[PDB]
Amino acid sequence: TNFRTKEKPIIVAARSESEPVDVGVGAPIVVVETTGEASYCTIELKSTA
Amino acid sequence: MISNNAPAKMVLNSIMTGYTLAYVQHSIYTDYDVIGRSFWLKVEESIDRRDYTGVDTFFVMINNLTPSTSYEIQGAFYDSIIDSELLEAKIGINLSNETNFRTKEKPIIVAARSESEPVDVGVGAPIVVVETTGEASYCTIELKSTASEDSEWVKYYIGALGPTIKFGGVPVGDYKIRISGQVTMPDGVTVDSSGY
Amino acid sequence: MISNNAPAKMVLNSIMTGYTLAYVQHSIYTDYDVIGRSFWLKVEESIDR
């Protein structure tokens, strides 16, 4: 029998974009492109400041 | 006489129902002469006889089931001596107790709308509120813009299925909405879908 | 001779693959003299027993 192991989810591309609202600036939303295999993923961020 | 007693009364351990595929668990067997397994699924009045020679697995897979439909199931184990004619006659076998169940409902979009909270300074981000009914382990919802026919079904919410669905981030415009259901059988490798 | 026939052909019921751990399901056994289970995983050319 032939099979294949799961792929580790890795961060391919990531960016944050805020929708331009007429009155001010909308809340930014981080858009991340990832590849891999996982039942569920946990993403954490650490400030570099 | 040859010690070919009737097989011991088989009891359905557990059953899982999906859209068209279903998980059925059956008890163990002890007679050495038993070589095959037979099952009787009764919908409305007619009964379908599904037979499987494999006995090494404590569970069987059932397909070709109409979603959102109730069924009655029976099963039995047959030896080499008992033929198929007696199987239709159901003579000389220990029939399992009849069990009733129902297939899962395909998640469909009942009502859908998008509302933006009115903030004092400007207009808040709109949130799409969708009313849906059906059964699914988790649901994936994609939207395709109607302004351009080349628009793709952009992902907007993936998660558990619920009658009340709220999500934002949708740009202002005209779009189509479609839903897809997904159910995974306890093996974790077999997954049932309700389509789009 | 001693009725030590070869064990019945074992069929892999189901297999699940992860990152490094994997689930493998195997069929039942009937011979009384069988005492152990062996497996052969072949990656590329080499096979691990």
Side-chain angles (χ1 to χ4, degrees), chain A residues 1 4 11 15-18 24 27 31 34-36 40 43 45 49:
Chain A
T1 311
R4 194 166 198 277
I11 306 163
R15 77 186 185 280
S16 178
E17 302 179 359
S18 68
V31 194
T34 48
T35 54
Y40 77 99
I43 299 169
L45 282 72

XYZ file of all heavy atoms in Angstrom, chain A residues 1 4 11 15-18 24 27 31 34-36 40 43 45 49:
125
model
N 0.837 -1.190 0.000
C 0.000 0.000 0.000
C 0.876 1.244 0.000
O 1.868 1.318 0.731
C -0.935 0.021 1.211
O -1.591 -1.247 1.330
C -1.982 1.115 1.056
N 1.107 8.869 1.716
C 1.997 10.005 1.892
C 1.676 10.702 3.204
O 0.511 10.845 3.581
C 1.886 10.997 0.731
C 3.012 12.010 0.694
C 3.066 12.732 -0.637
N 4.353 13.385 -0.836
C 4.669 14.577 -0.346
N 3.810 15.277 0.376
N 5.879 15.074 -0.584
N 3.939 29.304 6.493
C 3.475 30.610 6.045
C 4.168 30.926 4.725
O 5.381 31.146 4.685
C 3.751 31.696 7.091
C 3.167 31.291 8.444
C 3.167 33.023 6.639
C 3.730 32.073 9.613
N 0.194 39.390 4.584
C 0.072 40.836 4.498
C -1.190 41.255 5.236
O -2.073 40.439 5.507
C 0.045 41.308 3.043
C -1.289 41.089 2.355
C -1.207 41.433 0.880
N -2.509 41.336 0.232
C -3.062 40.200 -0.169
N -2.454 39.037 -0.004
N -4.259 40.231 -0.750
N -1.260 42.540 5.562
C -2.419 43.116 6.228
C -2.922 44.287 5.404
O -2.136 45.153 5.006
C -2.082 43.572 7.648
O -3.208 44.166 8.269
N -4.222 44.312 5.148
C -4.846 45.363 4.360
C -6.038 45.937 5.117
O -6.820 45.216 5.738
C -5.271 44.833 2.988
C -4.129 44.259 2.170
C -4.591 43.726 0.831
O -5.807 43.786 0.557
O -3.740 43.255 0.050
N -6.162 47.260 5.058
C -7.281 47.957 5.669
C -8.162 48.516 4.566
O -7.686 49.209 3.662
C -6.811 49.083 6.598
O -6.215 50.139 5.865
N -12.836 58.033 7.365
C -11.705 57.456 8.060
C -11.071 56.286 7.340
O -11.105 56.207 6.108
N -10.822 49.010 9.695
C -9.935 48.181 10.496
C -9.103 47.271 9.595
O -9.651 46.586 8.725
C -10.735 47.341 11.489
N -4.066 39.262 5.756
C -4.318 38.224 4.764
C -3.057 37.384 4.636
O -1.991 37.905 4.285
C -4.723 38.822 3.406
C -5.302 37.742 2.506
C -5.719 39.952 3.605
N -0.979 30.316 3.082
C -0.302 29.212 3.745
C -0.556 27.918 2.986
O -1.576 27.755 2.313
C -0.764 29.054 5.200
O -2.196 29.083 5.252
C -0.201 30.168 6.067
N 0.396 26.995 3.110
C 0.282 25.670 2.523
C 0.715 24.635 3.549
O 1.634 24.862 4.341
C 1.131 25.530 1.253
O 2.483 25.904 1.538
C 0.586 26.415 0.142
N 0.045 23.487 3.524
C 0.323 22.388 4.420
C -0.942 21.640 4.762
O -2.023 21.912 4.228
N -6.460 21.625 12.426
C -6.714 23.015 12.763
C -5.378 23.681 13.049
O -4.401 23.022 13.416
C -7.665 23.145 13.958
C -7.015 22.874 15.292
C -6.589 23.914 16.106
C -6.831 21.574 15.741
C -5.995 23.668 17.327
C -6.240 21.318 16.961
C -5.823 22.367 17.749
O -5.233 22.115 18.965
N -2.400 30.425 15.168
C -1.488 31.453 14.686
C -1.310 32.481 15.791
O -2.294 33.038 16.294
C -2.004 32.113 13.400
C -2.138 31.071 12.290
C -1.072 33.234 12.971
C -2.892 31.565 11.079
N 1.188 35.939 17.148
C 2.055 37.020 16.709
C 2.765 37.633 17.904
O 2.163 37.835 18.963
C 1.276 38.107 15.959
C 0.887 37.841 14.502
C -0.223 36.805 14.385
C 0.487 39.139 13.819
N 8.661 45.340 18.377
C 9.082 46.566 19.047
C 9.802 46.258 20.352
O 10.824 46.877 20.670
C 7.875 47.469 19.297
